[PDB]
Amino acid sequence: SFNQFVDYTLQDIICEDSTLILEQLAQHTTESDNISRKYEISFGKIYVTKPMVNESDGVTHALYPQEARLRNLTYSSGLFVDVKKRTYEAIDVPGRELKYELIAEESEGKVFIGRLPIMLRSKNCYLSEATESDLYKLKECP
């Protein structure tokens, strides 16, 4: 169940409301200000790292289940999503539908969106690829 959720469900959830559009109306106050701007943020593909922990001093290193238990930490991995940011603007001629046009401002980039706890012996866990000998090395019970 967890493998299915991590592999497919996470991508599906983001692809539901990935798009946010903010509309800046004409705000007719003078003829020199009659341009309407449209700013849109779009979420692309999501990426998941291996389990890791960030310390107070700011050093980040891979975390193993054995270390997590002793230090009262959380066994979790980071979530990153590619974000595509665009903005459209058009001339708001009175009494006519507007034609939003790309204004040569499109930036792309990974943004942290939180830590997802990782269940042990999962596809994203460190112990899935560990053999019997490897598990003994990491101080884990087969």
């Binding site: 946010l20 509309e23 705000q27």
Partner: peptide, 9 residues
């Protein structure tokens, strides 16, 4: 005057 900040679905 409008709200000058509107979100569209």
């Amino acid at each position: 005057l409008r709200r000058k900040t509107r979100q569209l679905k």
